[PDB]
Structures are given as structure tokens and as C-alpha cells.
Amino acid sequence: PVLTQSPSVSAAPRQRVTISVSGSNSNIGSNTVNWIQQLPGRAPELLMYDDDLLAPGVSDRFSGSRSGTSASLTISGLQSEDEADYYAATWDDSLNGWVFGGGTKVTVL
């Protein structure tokens, strides 16, 4: 994957976890990042866009950030329904198209 995401994370309910992704100046370094939530057998859901903006209806427990060639997604007050795979997405000027990370599994104990 063009984008490199953080390894799988397991946390108890009510904990705060932060997932990260790293890229280059051709993607993250120059374009805003989007975060996607993926549940088994379901369509992917847009959680955040423009680095830190919440898609309509998304819980404000999710927050985003971007600086340099990296970005991160923070989930506060983790819940059982937060267990899923989270993917980072951004535009790459070198490839002239969308690039995606490999995904990070968030497991709620």
C-alpha cells in the first residue's frame, strides 16, 4: 500500500486509542486525509474528511489530525460497536488518483 497504517490495536471499553498513517509529500504531505470504517460484510463508511471534519451523523468521539506526511485518527470512549477495520485514504498527485492504506483493526475487549 502507498500509505502505511499502524498495527492492530486492542483496547478495553472507555479507553482512548489513536491510529496513525504515514505517506509522502505526493499524498499526505500535500492532500487532506479521509478515514473509512469497514465492518465485515457491510459497505465502507466515511468517518472523517479534510483531516479533521466529521461526516454527517458521525459521533464526535472520532477526531482526526494531519501534520507533515502523517495523519492519525483518535477514538475516545471506545465502544463495542467501534470494533472494526479503519482505513486511511488520500489523493496522490504522482499517481493522479486515490491511494489507500492497508487498514488497522481496532478490537474492543
Binding site: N34, I36, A43, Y87, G97, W98
Partner: protein, 56 residues
């Protein structure tokens, strides 16, 4: 405007992660998404129906 683009990324993601499609079918669907974004839904639907029909 950024929101609509982000939403556009979703279809790309789904089609990129459909395991039962050929490389040519996948590439064709992606190219459809690039050439006519207003057809996104349609494309996706078709892709889905193909990915199900070619399941093992």
C-alpha cells in the same frame, strides 16, 4: 466539495476490495468511476452483481 470527493473515494475503495473480480473487470470499473462520477452508484451496483455472480 471536499465531502463529495471523500464520498467518491468510498466507491473506489469498495471496488478495489472486491475479491471475485478479474483484474480487467476491476480496472474497467475504476476507469468508469473516473470518467463519469455521476454514474458511481450504477457502476458500484454492477460491480457488486458481478462480484457475487463469480463467487466460489
Amino acid at each position: 466539495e471536499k465531502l463529495m470527493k471523500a464520498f467518491q473515494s468510498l466507491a473506489f475503495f469498495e471496488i478495489l476490495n472486491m475479491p471475485n473480480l478479474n483484474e480487467a473487470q476491476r480496472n474497467g470499473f475504476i476507469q468508469s468511476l473516473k470518467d463519469d462520477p455521476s454514474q458511481s452508484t450504477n457502476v458500484l451496483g454492477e460491480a457488486k452483481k458481478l462480484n457475487e455472480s463469480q463467487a466460489p
